[PDB]
Design a protein around this ligand. Structure first.
Ligand SMILES: Nc1ncnc2c1ncn2[C@@H]1O[C@H](COP(=O)(O)OP(=O)(O)OP(=O)(O)O)[C@@H](O)[C@H]1O
Ligand SMILES: Nc1ncnc2c1ncn2[C@@H]1O[C@H](COP(=O)(O)OP(=O)(O)OP(=O)(O)O)[C@@H](O)[C@H]1O
Ligand SMILES: CNC1=NC(=O)[C@H]([C@H](C)c2c[nH]c3cccc(F)c23)O1
Ligand SMILES: CNC1=NC(=O)[C@H]([C@H](C)c2c[nH]c3cccc(F)c23)O1
Ligand SMILES: [Mg+2]
Ligand SMILES: [Mg+2]
Lengths: 319, 319
């Protein structure tokens, strides 16, 4: 319809989403898109906060969209679009920066774009009257700024911006690195060794799961605190399977960590193959992906430009 | 035609331009628009770096445009338009901030918008392939950043942005306050007492010219250094008249400062009346001013959107 409005975005900063993106974010999107009016964005403007190769950035914009479909985003149920194609984001970003404290952006955990991108992220969400933002844990402080500036703006102009609720999971809120269970799996960690990429060679990812840092307790128990690597593997295995962790952990009574890494690599391999097949097709036959993105952008402009003119009108701009 | 491209903008932050704006900037625009393809912008996005009353901001956007015409901007020779109506400015601003050092913007002589507006100013100019920027002295450091980021961007993507030349006058590069000849006449000085507003009551402005702080030398000599107030009055009188300062200063041999303030107030009054009459008509009959601004914005979008897609293409964005 047009309510329970959802918005979330991933950066085209690499040739593959990793498990963090797919289980911590896109999995939530897939569950939600059924009864939520959803907008899913490849946020290429954010990518260039860091220097980007032009050939790769265009390639990765499509590859990221396609991974959205290969994870189950349904272009009949949701809108996929590329951020740079909707001018409203930057328009709203300028306005919102005028309502963002300098210290407020300083305290976010060097270029101007590196300093202001949380404001652009704020405009990304608020531009679509978003009710709910499915993100992982690391995007939380960002979206608390987005809500503060929305309330800051609404106090001067009541009823203009929707204040969004932050919808972040529990299990999957942070998929940690496999060699470094203290850090989150992310695209700039130096080693893809702890990095499980959706589109990597499934036997390569399986070999990283086998080399996952565990403890010595010889006990398969879910405690993210003291058993980081081990709780990660179960977190991962539970997410790619649909099986609750407790039902796994009890099934792992008597088992050691070898059986744990085997089953998790078993399941990740069976997870990523249907994805890689879908992604391959979409890259070799781009007609579909570009039709989706083209309809996506027109629908996004239809919504986001109306928000911008409402904000502009409230500010006193001549329309 | 479409070459010797000129761009410059004033903020709709008050109900009247003062002499600084009109002699330090708009006078140059009027001379230049004859053989320069000129774009003159009411920069309302910049206004809201400081909180603005919505009714006043819309009123002042039109009043500022109209003062452009009442000073001799010819809508058949130049484009007048409102910044917020051309999305390209913010688009290009986001890109350019990604190429602007944080320290680089720090060193510009608190909100995020207050911190980034020189980047938005940079996009304002570079969005139109601008060859020359007629500004007063205070806008210089700003436009040196605009050129640095343009060269910074062109080194990665050669031939994309025009690097603009900064065109700043001498006499009129800084019209100083009348009570405080050490400061520049500006709209946020606390007293309009030293402020000569184009649209103020001409006898009120004349009374401020009579109360202008001079020295004691009893000699009418142009030296901005030691004779601030006195050189200002001659600077002012020379600009509103067309008479060189030396031809005035020699004409003022034997004269005292009373004759100087009288003649300067004589000339300012005869300057501002034709303006106030034109401005009144344009406010009472807005049809004309809005036709100008509407054609202005379409021509500005035609140019500035082509620049944005060229920049976007060079970055690797999917178009
Ligand atoms: N390790 C992770 N676990 C769970 N979710 C994650 C993880 N990393 C990123 N996300 C989620 O991915 C979404 C988009 O993040 P982003 O595109 O920045 O991915 P990233 O791995 O942080 O990439 P980069 O390192 O280039 O910033 C957000 O919802 C964020 O919470
Ligand atoms: N005192 C002055 N003398 C000469 N030029 C000036 C003066 N003040 C501003 N200008 C010129 O006016 C143009 C636009 O400036 P702006 O709209 O900021 O006016 P301002 O007086 O500085 O207003 P504010 O105080 O609201 O910033 C620039 O080209 C700038 O150089
Ligand atoms: C460097 N730019 C950057 N890093 C981040 O982590 C965010 C993130 C990718 C994001 C942008 N827009 C969004 C809208 C909704 C949800 C989001 F997670 C986002 O942007
Ligand atoms: C708070 N914003 C702000 N203060 C300034 O002094 C500049 C100035 C008004 C400006 C904006 N865009 C321009 C393009 C060309 C020439 C210009 F003088 C400008 O902007
Ligand atoms: Mg990130
Ligand atoms: Mg100023």
């Amino acid at each position: 319809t047009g309510s329970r409005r959802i918005f979330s975005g991933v950066q085209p900063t690499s040739d593959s989403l990793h498990l963090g993106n797919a289980l911590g974010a896109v999995a939530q999107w897939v569950g939600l898109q059924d009864d939520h009016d959803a907008f899913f964005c490849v946020v290429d403007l954010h990518a260039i906060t860091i220097p980007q190769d032009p050939e790769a950035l265009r390639r990765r914009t499509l590859i990221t969209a396609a991974q959205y479909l290969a994870l189950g985003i349904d272009p009949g149920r949701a809108t996929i679009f590329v951020q740079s194609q909707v001018p409203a984001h930057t328009q709203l970003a300028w306005v919102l920066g005028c309502f963002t404290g300098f210290g407020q952006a300083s305290r976010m955990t060097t270029t101007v774009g590196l300093f202001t991108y949380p404001v652009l992220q704020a405009a990304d969400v608020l531009a679509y009257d978003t009710e709910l933002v499915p993100v992982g844990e690391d995007q939380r402080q960002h979206l608390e700024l987005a809500r503060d500036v929305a309330q800051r703006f609404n106090s001067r102009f009541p009823g203009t911006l929707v204040v969004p609720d932050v919808l972040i999971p529990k299990m999957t809120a942070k998929i940690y690195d496999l060699q470094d269970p203290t850090s989150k799996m992310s695209k700039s960690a130096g080693t893809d060794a702890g990095l499980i990429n959706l589109l990597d060679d499934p036997a390569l990812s399986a070999k990283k799961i086998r080399s996952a840092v565990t403890d010595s307790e010889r006990d398969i128990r879910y405690d993210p605190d003291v058993k980081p690597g081990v709780s990660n593997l179960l977190n991962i295995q539970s997410a790619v399977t649909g099986t609750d962790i407790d039902v796994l952990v009890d099934g792992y009574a008597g088992h050691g960590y070898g059986d744990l890494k085997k089953d998790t690599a078993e399941a990740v391999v069976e997870f990523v193959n249907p994805i890689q097949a879908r992604v391959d097709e979409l890259t070799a036959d781009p007609a579909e992906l570009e039709a989706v993105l083209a309809a996506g952008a027109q629908r996004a402009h239809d919504v986001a430009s109306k928000t911008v003119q409402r904000v502009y009108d409230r500010l006193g701009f001549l329309l």
